[model samples]
Target: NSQAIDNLRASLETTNQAIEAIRQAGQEMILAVQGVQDYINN
Candidate 1:
């Protein structure tokens, strides 16, 4: 088995969940900022 492959995949998987949580956490950032800005505008 390839250890680097395993580690890379592990980071990808972890980052997937992390990205979603980061979105929901809602800050003036790339992913989360759009919706909050739209809502604030409306």
Candidate 2:
């Protein structure tokens, strides 16, 4: 039971890290899109 709990904790941590990375990438993508739109408009 203890080992199972430890594994679950590790999995949760890894998932959290991946979610953070994706969130950062998503923000960057939004910025890039906005820049392209501005360039086209100008």
Candidate 3:
């Protein structure tokens, strides 16, 4: 039972990290798109 709980906690931590990374990457992508849009608009 303890082992199973540990495994689940580890899995959740890994998934959370992945989600944070993806969120940050999305923010960077949005900034990049904004830059392109500015260039096009100018």
C-alpha lDDT score of every prediction, in listed order = 0.83, 1.00, 1.00
Q: Each prediction's TM-score against the native?
A: 0.52, 0.85, 0.88
Q: Give the lDDT of residue 30 in candidate 3.
A: 100
Pairs in clash, predicted candidate 1: none
Query: What's the lDDT for candidate 2?
Result: 1.00
How would you encode candidate 1's per-residue C-alpha lDDT over 1-42 as one tens digit per residue? Answer: 699999999999999999989776665465567777888999
Q: What is the lDDT of candidate 1?
A: 0.83
Better model by lDDT, 1 or 2?
2
Order of quality (lDDT) = 3, 2, 1
Q: For every candidate structure, what is the RMSD over all alpha carbons to the true structure, in angstroms?
A: 5.6, 0.9, 0.8
Off by over 4 Å in 2: none
Candidate 1 segments whose C-alpha is farther than 4 A from its true place: 27-42
Q: What is the lDDT of residue 37 in candidate 2?
A: 100
What's the true lDDT of residue 36 in model 2?
100
Q: Where's the lowest-lDDT run of ten residues in candidate 1? A: 24-33
> Which candidate model has the greater lDDT, 1 or 3?
3
Q: In terms of TM-score, how similar is model 2 to the real structure? A: 0.85
